[PDB]
């Protein structure tokens, strides 16, 4: 099933949860899913260890319990795999398969000097992520935080959708709004919970893959990649003026095919957006 770790094991294998970034000599890889993520090395295997931090306690155990329940049921090549967990004490940890190529956001940004992703590889990554989302939707889960920074990349650059648990079952309303603003559908930003909002957010990821630009850049005009989309519709701009210049293999025809899928995903009216299945068909027809 899952591996039951005890906290002392995870502490030993993460340099006692060394919170400096890995660049600096520590074990921290990021923060999210209600915790800090650290690199560990256990039994000849590199792992990612998420140590949950307290919203409040008591609801934390419920969320940890729920994330495990979701992962037990959600096994797929385009989803991050949970390996085990630690629950002894006031301390809660989740242990995942390690993804050596980091996030799609970081690779689109060539963080740390990694080479630019080719157009052909971007197309594969887009299809992989759509496959992961389709598995989630088929199994009545809503991700709620679809973004490039949550699409991880293994040894082969296979797309791995991460950070659910918070993955609700499947129009509900909520007082505690979650997600990442620059990626959120307008109805999600008002608190409607629906798988159609994951589609919208996936439209945004597609624009990041096309253009190489982050969804938000506060030193850019416009700060929001979403707006750049309205420029193309309303302002004599073309997607071609926006194609990532860090590629040498992006043909006009498939670029436009992906942009058209992005544009369908991005309808403001949730009911006009394609479903994940259609998005897969489209992304497949694209290659």
Curated annotation (Swiss-Prot):
Signal peptide: none annotated. Changing residue 132 to D: In IMD67; decreases inhibition of NF-kappa-B complex activation; impairs neutrophil migration and phagocytosis. The modification Phosphoserine is found at residue 175. GO terms for molecular function: ATP binding; interleukin-1 receptor binding; kinase activity; magnesium ion binding; protein kinase binding; protein serine kinase activity; protein serine/threonine kinase activity. It is linked to Immunodeficiency 67: An autosomal recessive primary immunodeficiency characterized by recurrent, life-threatening systemic and invasive bacterial infections beginning in infancy or early childhood. It is an enzyme of class 2 (transferase). Associates with MYD88 and IRAK2 to form a ternary complex called the Myddosome. Once phosphorylated, IRAK4 dissociates from the receptor complex and then associates with the TNF receptor-associated factor 6 (TRAF6), IRAK1, and PELI1; this intermediate complex is required for subsequent NF-kappa-B activation. Direct binding of SMAD6 to PELI1 prevents complex formation and hence negatively regulates IL1R-TLR signaling and eventually NF-kappa-B-mediated gene expression. Interacts with IL1RL1. Interacts (when phosphorylated) with IRAK1. May interact (when phosphorylated) with IRAK3. Phosphorylated. GO terms for biological process: cytokine-mediated signaling pathway; innate immune response; interleukin-1-mediated signaling pathway; interleukin-33-mediated signaling pathway; intracellular signal transduction; JNK cascade; lipopolysaccharide-mediated signaling pathway; MyD88-dependent toll-like receptor signaling pathway. It is found in: Cytoplasm. Its main location: cytoplasm. Belongs to the protein kinase superfamily. TKL Ser/Thr protein kinase family. Pelle subfamily. The active site is at residue 145. This is Interleukin-1 receptor-associated kinase 4.
